[PDB]
Design a protein around this ligand. Structure first.
Ligand code: SF4
Ligand code: SF4
Ligand code: SF4
Ligand code: SF4
Ligand code: FCO
Ligand code: FCO
Ligand code: F3S
Ligand code: F3S
Ligand SMILES: [Mg+2]
Ligand SMILES: [Mg+2]
Ligand code: NI
Ligand code: NI
Lengths: 551, 267, 267, 551
């Protein structure tokens, strides 16, 4: 029996502490703690509704764009504004491209070093490594020559005795199962991923005006002036430039990221039977394409007790059943008001009192949906799409399964997706489907401009009396996001963000029910309590973002 | 041997680190493999928990007097620093401990440079700038939310290649990036001069690329290089060029204080 | 099937073709494999001599009424066309024949758009513009020496995607690229406004990025997008940004007529 | 005999006609004709000496930069101006990066289709192709997957029925000797070349202000403002950006272009035994690095009757022996004055009277050096460097020879370099050595700025009376270039350009001696006189630029 702390958890966004009780070499109980707070909800209070998005975008720079978009959607909701369709196309392209960058960086820069041993890569034969990928990928940068150059970069780094961010990593740990060759392939793909993510953010920059932190939104649409014949504005040349970057993303995503995902499963199949965080899942529909903030390209819904057959579809961001279900509690959080609160009536009154295992131990609130704990994020969004019978999602998952089949002789069933690896797989599927979103929305924009619609913005009015409530939903890279705005006498009288990492990372709730991170860890085998790699493997699968979780 | 760098995040959103992933000269991969030895950075470190804090302590000892310390985020001082706790201690203490042995110290971003968004409004956590936390040290300020990453990387490069910081203004900002008002080097100045103003997004003047002063542009009161260096190295990309006014995110008392549409004072 | 293009060079320096090799959206390889079918271009064609002339004749027939004709360089009329002879015939004859069946006709560069350098001074060869040689036709002019290649590529894409040319000014130049004076959209206007001028290259004001008016900048009398779209898609690259005045190369009566250091008239 | 004409010669710069008399399938006599003239020399007359460079740069947009640089050097010569060393570093980086672009484009875009059969590439096995390169190159983009992708682009193009630039090529010609696999490799490299040459011109752009046609020169230096601490000027950030593109060039150059040059020689060794154009060779030293327009990184010289051991070094652009030797004749050109003219006394008086075999037949003049015909360009520059015992050049040639020997078992002797293939090899060697020039000069610049020297420009004075003469030499991608300016009463009273393709393409001279292109063609076998590929192979090896030759 023993108690460990993992603080800081690295290769995430933000400040996270994980505690675990280990008994008989398996985690028996866990605590997740967000250890930094800013009070972003209070900072934005009393301001003009139109200004909120620029301030609350700074909740997070990893998921940049997301809080900006949710905030404008919340104001638009409160005010009953229908966004111009061109503004939806532009918002959608930004979100999709951003998410592409986000997911690639998560799989490679954040998560790969849980599964990949760089010391072992030094012992690889580059030709054998390349040979392994024959018939498995058509990627044009898996040659022995590429792998040799990468191996030499590792050789030289190790030679210098300055390992920096690769130092004191978990090399030779018993839970590292990849052969030398596969470790080398992964490091090469790690480096290649950085080129691809750069291209995805060039898309974002050309519409956003920069990234991180886009600056082209407004309550009422966007600030991009569409004029094909205009100097200095969003003309056909600038649109061609955007398209040239959208076109560069697919090959890496399809031939490297999608494949590596199938491969990590093939070598680590035990991780398909651990890391279940919840039995309930929620996602919201995303990428509206009509003139009335609807006709989403991706579906949403609610799954209860893992039953896809009886899930409830969510097709509208104004769905009262979704709106009325959401509450947050601070019983085991460092805030004063503990009973579950609907976010329009939410408070965020800090009440720090140090760590207690049975008391308050986190700046993260505890969200519930009709009193239940729910997992959000790519696992949720894939399961909902499978529930909806979405052919694109079925087909993409099947491609991953077929690679896994080929390598192992085994298949993957839906039951195995409720796991650390299923979570990773849902993220990869999402990144893949997002490339079609980009192509679809670019084409829609070009077509609409060609019909003579250059409208991008409708100037809002905000009544100087009255109290109005609005909620902006967004399917972010880490899951369902919502910003909740109350306007009274023209200014923001309450602002509450309920963020996807809040749902997943949040501590024990009003009824002391365990959140997804904490739940997912029960049962985790830990070969060495001083180097708890297995715990971090599961926690990374959720893509924690603690500036998001706490704000 | 590469020059050592220790990066510590306080009340950060990670946007300042994320700027590095857009950089091209050097790219992040060339930064960490060729330009510097990144001895501590929680976003990319293989090691976690006990192992990473050991990396840091060892590096602080091994590279005493040689490393560049970088901080993003504001430092919260209220209630004895408990608004940011890492390995059970206030970040302000980690930062002061690392600052003791630093060859140079850099506040990357508006949050660390002057408090930024985290310190705005009522300042719930008593957030302050890096320089406020280190009164006896010269802190180089690279503001912006986030800055163009080369405002940082060419500052570090000047330190490595020529052995001293770049030339700094009276806020300790490098003159190559922050030496001039955006409005004193803005390609829309001709429209400002002629009274050619966008009045609302999507209007005819807006769709001709006119000046954004009457939309709330803060270029008149914001020092920076957004109109010249711009962003992302693709050509033509900064907020005004895309159609939105500057918000003043670089500049204390402007960004996160004034409304988007509130008009700037013109000199 | 891809839309066909016939490219004929007259008194060209090849700089206009070479601009395509700098292009990124599309790159020249994507232009020729994906965007268009380049049915005749002597710089890249596998075929030569009789074979390439056969390709042209066959293309003019197969794609009658469908191809875009592009011409770079001026057309020399002195002495019955003999200052440019291809396959034993004056180029003016090749151009007139190809123009007969063209869906659209583009003068790429200042030479074909208004005579350019080749028609300057004493004009040794009686060089004229493409429009002068084709009086019955609407020639789309894309000037500059050479223009940014996307001034051409986005003009072609507009024809391909929306089925007609872009909006043109009264010199038949696309307004997205030539609709505004460079000086009415130049980032150095604030310096002009304040009387902040470089007086010589390398002087203190030059080394602070001041206005180049007193070095002969022709921005005040030249229409173009050099200050916004700029060149090469790397960011920050055009003559003035690099430290040299605009010469007026886009603009008839300016470039190749006025001296580098001769002052522009300001409106 | 049979008489043929090749008009237009494609895959060159400009307007060229070649005629050949063929006796029993072998060329017996040839004529080279430049068929377009502008009169650029006359256009620049009567202007301020400071203005010339902007106007004469427009002689050529393929060899952009070169006439700009030669023109300022000519004015500086006349005025006796010593150019600041920072301006030299900047000019040198621009010329070396430009030439890198130029040579890569010449080998792949202009010349490869003389030697490569794209229809044969469709029959290739991509795996076999890739295996052929094992141990021959370390390039990272020679995988079967890359090659399969390239093969499919070709297949798709052919299937469209719209071959465009590829239509009516010389596919299945008896002079095409490469196997399918090598044809495919070459096509892949042709496409990859386009990326590398784009990076080279990003270097040029960042110092020149744009390319084509740089705009950063001045009589007296450069217009780049050096200030490491300045906003909007040439600061350290900009310098790092330039360096980032310099670093991208070497791998393609060394691992692709260099290798393909050796391989072409291996499959076409007969082309080491034909295409000899001259027995005398000239090049000028290049890349000055001192404060007095000297201390060149590359040496120059004059080789007579192919005797490297007795060559004459040229180490100064003020060398009176070089200067006094140069003349041009118009006996068989369309100008009025026929006797050989020193260029400071040159005229360019047009006198077109149509084609005559024995009379005037070209707009190109006929240059001589002390009355002899001379070949210029990369063969000349390589031979002079070998004559000088430049180790860098000998080592680089030896690397090419090593690959050739690995494939053929044969070595290459200097005698075999006086040939079509030797000319191509000299160009490749040049491109390879130019990468070290770029590193050296970038480092020199950084170092010099670090000592406190930010100077870039010496303002000239121009006497308002008096007549004075200058000449500016430059070793251009196609060979020795010289611009000759006479200033009288403050304005240009004569201007004569003697351009490298003028030396090589010029017609029979005042003594009816044949120039290099015409001499090189004697002996060429022509399998099909309707499709004289063999003639175009030889002509393209000189990298003709007829806007340059004729101006
Ligand atoms: S300066 Fe801006 S981008 Fe950087 S940490 Fe602060 S909020 Fe984030
Ligand atoms: S107000 Fe803004 S957009 Fe207008 S000139 Fe000034 S900085 Fe530029
Ligand atoms: S416009 Fe300029 S670049 Fe184009 S052909 Fe004329 S001289 Fe050359
Ligand atoms: S004169 Fe030239 S540099 Fe000065 S503001 Fe006008 S266009 Fe810009
Ligand atoms: N994705 C993301 Fe950030 C979190 N959690 C948000 O919203
Ligand atoms: N290179 C080149 Fe052009 C030619 N010939 C010049 O000078
Ligand atoms: S908002 Fe910030 S990024 Fe530049 S344009 Fe204004 S200082
Ligand atoms: S010289 Fe020409 S390229 Fe632009 S900057 Fe002036 S119009
Ligand atoms: Mg909240
Ligand atoms: Mg001449
Ligand atoms: Ni986040
Ligand atoms: Ni040339």
């Amino acid at each position: 029996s023993q108690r460990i702390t993992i603080d800081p958890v690295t290769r995430i966004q933000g400040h996270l502490r994980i505690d675990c009780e280990i008994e008989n070499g398996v985690v028996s109980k866990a605590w997740a703690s967000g250890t930094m707070w800013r009070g972003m909800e209070e900072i934005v209070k009393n301001r003009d509704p139109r200004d909120a998005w620029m301030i609350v975008q700074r909740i997070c720079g990893v998921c940049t764009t997301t809080h900006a978009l949710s905030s404008v959607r919340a104001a638009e909701s409160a005010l009953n504004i229908d966004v111009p369709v061109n503004a939806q196309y532009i918002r959608n392209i930004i979100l999709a491209a951003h998410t592409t960058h986000d997911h690639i960086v998560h799989f490679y820069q954040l998560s790969a070093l849980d599964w990949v041993d760089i010391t072992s890569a030094l012992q690889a034969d580059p030709t054998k490594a390349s040979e392994m990928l024959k018939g498995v990928s058509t990627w044009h940068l898996n040659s022995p020559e590429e792998f040799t150059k990468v191996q030499n970069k590792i050789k030289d780094l190790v030679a210098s005795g300055q390992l920096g961010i690769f130092a004191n990593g978990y090399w030779g740990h018993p839970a590292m199962k990849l052969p030398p060759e596969v470790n080398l392939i992964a490091v090469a793909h790690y480096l290649q991923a950085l080129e691809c993510q750069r291209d995805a953010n060039r898309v974002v920059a050309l519409l956003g005006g920069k990234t991180p932190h886009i600056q082209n939104l407004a309550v009422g649409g966007v600030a991009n002036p569409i004029n094909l014949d205009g100097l200095g504005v969003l003309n056909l040349e600038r649109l061609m430039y955007i398209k040239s970057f959208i076109d560069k993303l697919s090959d890496f995503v399809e031939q490297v990221y999608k494949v590596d995902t199938a491969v990590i499963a093939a070598f680590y199949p035990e991780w398909l039977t651990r890391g279940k965080g919840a039995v309930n899942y929620l996602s919201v529909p995303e990428f509206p394409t009509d003139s009335k903030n609807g006709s989403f390209l991706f579906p949403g819904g609610y799954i209860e007790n893992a039953d896809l057959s009886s899930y409830r579809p969510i097709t509208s961001h104004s769905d009262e059943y979704l709106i009325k279900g959401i509450q947050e509690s601070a019983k085991h959080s460092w805030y004063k008001d503990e009973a579950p609160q609907a976010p329009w009536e939410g408070t965020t009154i800090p009440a720090y009192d140090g760590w207690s295992d049975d008391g308050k131990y986190s700046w993260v609130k505890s969200p519930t949906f009709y009193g239940k704990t729910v997992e959000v994020g790519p696992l949720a969004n894939m399961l909902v799409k499978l529930a909806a019978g979405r052919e694109s999602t079925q087909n993409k998952l099947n491609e991953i399964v077929a690679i896994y089949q080929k390598l192992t002789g085994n298949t993957l069933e839906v039951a195995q997706l409720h796991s650390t690896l299923g979570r990773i797989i849902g993220r990869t599927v999402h990144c893949c489907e997002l490339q079609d979103i980009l192509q679809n929305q670019y084409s829609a924009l070009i077509t609409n401009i060609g019909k003579g619609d250059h409208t991008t913005f409708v100037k809002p009015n905000i009544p100087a009396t009255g109290e109005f409530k609005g909620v902006g939903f967004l399917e972010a890279p880490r899951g369902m996001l919502s910003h909740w705005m109350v306007i009274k006498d023209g200014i923001i009288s309450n602002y509450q963000a309920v963020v996807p990492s809040t749902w997943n990372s949040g501590p024990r709730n009003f009824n002391d029910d365990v959140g997804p991170y904490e739940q997912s860890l029960v049962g985790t085998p830990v070969a060495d309590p001083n180097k708890p790699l297995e715990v971090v493997r599961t926690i990374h699968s959720f893509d924690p973002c603690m500036a998001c979780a706490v704000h | 041997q590469r020059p050592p760098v220790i990066w510590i995040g306080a009340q950060e959103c990670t946007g300042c680190t994320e700027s590095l992933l857009r950089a091209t000269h050097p790219t992040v991969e060339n930064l960490v493999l060729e330009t510097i030895s990144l001895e501590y950075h929680e976003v990319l470190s293989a090691a976690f928990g006990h192992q990473v804090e050991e990396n840091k302590h060892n590096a602080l000892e091994k590279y005493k007097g040689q490393y560049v310390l970088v901080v993003d985020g504001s430092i919260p001082l209220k209630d004895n620093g408990i608004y940011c706790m890492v390995a059970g201690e206030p970040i302000v203490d980690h930062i002061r401990k690392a600052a003791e042995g630093a060859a140079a110290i850099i506040a990357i971003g508006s949050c660390s440079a002057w408090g930024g968004v985290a310190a705005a409004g009522v300042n719930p956590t008593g957030a302050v700038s890096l320089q406020e936390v280190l009164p006896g040290k010269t802190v180089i300020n690279i503001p912006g939310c986030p800055p163009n990453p080369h405002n940082f990387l060419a500052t570090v490069a000047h330190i490595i290649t020529y052995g001293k910081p770049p030339k700094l203004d009276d806020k300790n900002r490098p003159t190559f990036a922050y030496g001039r008002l955006i409005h004193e080097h803005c390609e829309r100045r001709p429209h400002f001069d002629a009274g050619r103003f966008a009045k609302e997004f999507g209007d005819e003047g807006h769709r001709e690329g006119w000046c954004l002063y009457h939309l709330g542009c803060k270029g008149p009161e914001t020092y920076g290089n957004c109109s010249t260096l711009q962003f992302c190295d693709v050509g033509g990309v900064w907020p005004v060029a895309i159609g939105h006014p500057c918000y003043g995110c670089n500049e204390e008392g402007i960004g996160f204080h004034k409304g988007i549409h509130q008009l700037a004072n013109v000199e």
